[PDB]
Amino acid sequence: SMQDPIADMLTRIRNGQAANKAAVTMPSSKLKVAIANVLKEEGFIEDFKVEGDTKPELELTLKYFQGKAVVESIQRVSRPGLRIYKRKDELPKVMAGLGIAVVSTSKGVMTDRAARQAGLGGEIICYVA
Amino acid sequence: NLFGEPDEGIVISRFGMHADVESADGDVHRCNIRRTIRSLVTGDRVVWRPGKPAAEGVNVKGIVEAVHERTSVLTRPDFYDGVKPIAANIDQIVIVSAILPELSLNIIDRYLVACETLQIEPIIVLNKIDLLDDEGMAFVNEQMDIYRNIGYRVLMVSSHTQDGLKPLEEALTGRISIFAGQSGVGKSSLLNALLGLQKEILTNDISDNSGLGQHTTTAARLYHFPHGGDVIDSPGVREFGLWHLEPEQITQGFVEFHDYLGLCKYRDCKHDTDPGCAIREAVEEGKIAETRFENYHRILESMAQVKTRKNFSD
Amino acid sequence: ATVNQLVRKPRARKVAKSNVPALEACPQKRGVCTRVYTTTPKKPNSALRKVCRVRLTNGFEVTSYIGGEGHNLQEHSVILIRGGRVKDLPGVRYHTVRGALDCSGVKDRKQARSKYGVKRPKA
RNA sequence: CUUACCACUUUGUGAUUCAUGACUGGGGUGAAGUCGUAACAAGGUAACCGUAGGGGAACCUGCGGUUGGAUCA
RNA sequence: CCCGCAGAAGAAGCACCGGCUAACUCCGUGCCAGCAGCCGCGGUAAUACGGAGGGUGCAAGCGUUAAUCGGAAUUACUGGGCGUAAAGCGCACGCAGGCGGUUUGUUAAGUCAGAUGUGAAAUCCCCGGGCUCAACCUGGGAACUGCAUCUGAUACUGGCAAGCUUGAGUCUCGUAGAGGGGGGUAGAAUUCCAGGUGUAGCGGUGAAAUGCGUAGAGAUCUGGAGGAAUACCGGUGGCGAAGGCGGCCCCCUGGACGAAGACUGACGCUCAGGUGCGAAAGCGUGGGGAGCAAACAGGAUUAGAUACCCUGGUAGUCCACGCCG
RNA sequence: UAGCUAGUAGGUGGGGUAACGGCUCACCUAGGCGACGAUCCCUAGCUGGUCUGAGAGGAUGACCAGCCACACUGGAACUGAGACACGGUCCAGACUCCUACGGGAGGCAGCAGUGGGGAAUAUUGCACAAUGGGCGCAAGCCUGAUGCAGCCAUGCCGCGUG
């Protein structure tokens, strides 16, 4: 059964980039909305929108700067089988800081950069490059 | 050195990696063989040397350096292996047959052809006559005489009852005699009876089951005859086929055929159905043993079946 | 595979089997030759290897190789064995220290003398 | 002087362990012996799996199964 | 520690040199003697064995053995795999356990932040200092990645409460199906028995033989008895968790799928142990036994045929109930 | 190696301890522990640390430092602030030693040293001069701790053999 929606969203994005789709659609979620907001802020994804009220759906517009996928690597790090929590100092750096690691801190969901600049540690949702 | 001065010796028996060698003094020892030696069988005469006799209060393995040239030798062709010798420096072979394991006028003829090609003097013995009834004895002798009618020494002996050995003993004295034949015919038991070896040491003897007997003796061992000479126990054999021998050498092997060479109008007379085949009519009037003629033909046609292999036997 | 499986049972490493068990991690041992005999090597090699079967101090009985040309070893000889392995001798995993308290050095050895207990020739 | 606790010990026994061991079962390695050649090509009766019976030996036969089998408009 | 005296005067060995791996030639030997960490060498010019010369490395040491870690991602947390190389239980249900859709509220257990206390000294590291240098000793710092307590943070996981319907399940209406269990029944065919006709062979093989037939075989017709299996349909077809399931009909019964609508409201996934099902062969008891057929009997072939082939033929093959797994 | 446990797990009361407590006893309750591995079996002193490794880890606990346990084997207590006491006591056992056969004596796992085992590991040395410690007002006495020396290429570092 579906036991992790976040990895599902990540793999939907990945397979959409591989199949060169233009827009993907997940069953939305507050957490999914927050992660999508991060990737829109970081210029990873062009835009996102939520429709419906009883069964809301999230829709994402994938980017392709040279026709090649803008997000060339994305992977869930803290999975349900094994959670991952990092303290502020030991927060990771994706591609030596060229990429972005999304972390949920006590002050919401933010990039590793914003987190350690705010001095806050959290669960590492995933790595986006 | 760890070894004694080299000396001449006989090969009492061969067991793969290492053989049994008797020195001129008459003491037998297990001795290794050098890899340069290629062939080494029972009866061979070798130059060897024993090891210094101080290890665990027993003797250490000797080394055999070389073998002397064989005088005579008994070989047999082996598919996948070519012709291989069983025992060398032999003077006489004794074809040992027995009624129970199998009666084979065909194996005896194959052996006769072989020994005729090897110039070794043969002798036919038929073991276990104790099993046959008196009528059956008269039913086996009137075809065992087939060979004694061409001079072959034919004897009938019962190893279990030691019956009629005595002429066999006489014929065995002062010669080197290899006991050959199919497995189960009684070659080991016959040796036990004749040699009268100590009860503690006897050759392996298992009884035959159903159609054919086991292969108990898997070796060829020399034994010193009580009166004089030597015998050799050999492993039983199934097929003494002769594809190595040329087809003419088979016509020569049948001794009852020289009386008719050059009497066939066709000079290249295959003698089967060619017109004017002297031995054809000879066997028509009973001069020749019909069974011998048929055996000659069938072993010839057997050579055609076993000529399939491209290996060489020279 | 799954982390949960590793938790239920951790990864068990592979302990190494010592190829010289009779040594008991001792660099050398002392034994008495109960039997000296000549053996044959594997098919690529042909020779009469001089080996000795030795009863060790710790109760173990093993076969040991004797290097160099010739030996003075016999029954009841107190030799010292060392670890090692002979490829062509199956079941022989020990050498004999040439020059160790019963076995003398090799005669007229001139090179690699220390490997055979041959003192420096007086010159 | 007595009573209680109690180390040692003695039996009746049970369990367990070590050393040794009569007498054996199979195994392994070497291999230049012996008997046949079991498998590899359709290996000359396709091999193999499970099971049962048989046989000096590799093996043979029955039952079901597989292709990890060739040939076959 | 310093000064003085004499004299090069008192002081160099060990391993290796086929590749890995820096270093090569002669002689002896001739699958012998021997070497060897691995591959490996040696049978007549051996750079691999032994000796010599030459060279390479290290040096008051040098080698060998033992032992540990590494290289080894070769137990893979960092950081491995399972179609054929080792590896998916035969299949299913299912307790414990692991994990868990979506919204709101609360809690602060996990988690994060801060503070405090502590984490002996030595040792490790850094900046210095002292032994003529170094080893060594030593000052200060860093570190001791840990633990504990307290105060907060509430995004995520957990707990609590209230929901929601998208997961899961129920209902209504139908469809297809060798799904399963039980009981009847049918038509071919094999064999057997009895009888009718009637002659001399039948049967079998590559060829034969064994075998059956003059009491009449085989052939053909009629009647009967019994057992087992269901040509054609038939399929790259269907059904079942798997093993498996094939004439027709009846009785009982499981699952799947489709349309529309309602209903419940996370009730879910997986599953160590456990339970159940589970081809063929096999075992127990009792029936039944047509055909087939291990074992066995016989005839051929063959050295033999203990096999393949042929003539027979028992267990078994079938049924009931257990067992086997 | 799947069950183990009856002072067993609790309670009340008494006793006992420097101190809480089944620490002990009487009675009462019928619990307690265990698949988050009890019990049983084998192995083992623990740590700071040491070796290796880029790191995570791996191996390990020789020297030095902290803790623990033991002092021929088993048991017990006394004395004392502190012991169930290495060079104290009692008993029992084994062994060794003395014997007048009546009975007695002993404990190097302190420093040297001997035999034995082993591949293997050193002197039956000097001094309390220094630092510690015991006693003493002190002087001072004692100290095989310690400071030094001896032996060993066992290791590291340095130097020479021109």
Ligand SMILES: Nc1nc2c(ncn2[C@@H]2O[C@H](COP(=O)(O)OP(=O)(O)NP(=O)(O)O)[C@@H](O)[C@H]2O)c(=O)[nH]1
């Ligand atoms: N009835 C009977 N049996 C005999 C007689 N001689 C020997 N036997 C038996 O027949 C068997 C023969 O075995 P064996 O002698 O080993 O046979 P082999 O012919 O030597 N050859 P292999 O060793 O290969 O079997 C034994 O059981 C033996 O005792 C005899 O005269 N009569």
Ligand SMILES: [Mg+2]
């Ligand atoms: Mg052969």
Ligand SMILES: [Mg+2]
């Ligand atoms: Mg025999």
Ligand SMILES: [Mg+2]
């Ligand atoms: Mg061929």
Ligand SMILES: [Mg+2]
């Ligand atoms: Mg074959």
Ligand SMILES: [Mg+2]
């Ligand atoms: Mg075949």
Ligand SMILES: [Mg+2]
């Ligand atoms: Mg059979």
Ligand SMILES: [Mg+2]
């Ligand atoms: Mg199947």
Ligand SMILES: [Mg+2]
């Ligand atoms: Mg080089």
Ligand SMILES: [Mg+2]
């Ligand atoms: Mg060469």
Ligand SMILES: [Mg+2]
């Ligand atoms: Mg040469």
Ligand SMILES: [Mg+2]
């Ligand atoms: Mg050389």
Ligand SMILES: [Mg+2]
């Ligand atoms: Mg040189």
Ligand SMILES: [Mg+2]
């Ligand atoms: Mg590793």
Ligand SMILES: [Mg+2]
């Ligand atoms: Mg792998």
Ligand SMILES: [Mg+2]
């Ligand atoms: Mg395979």
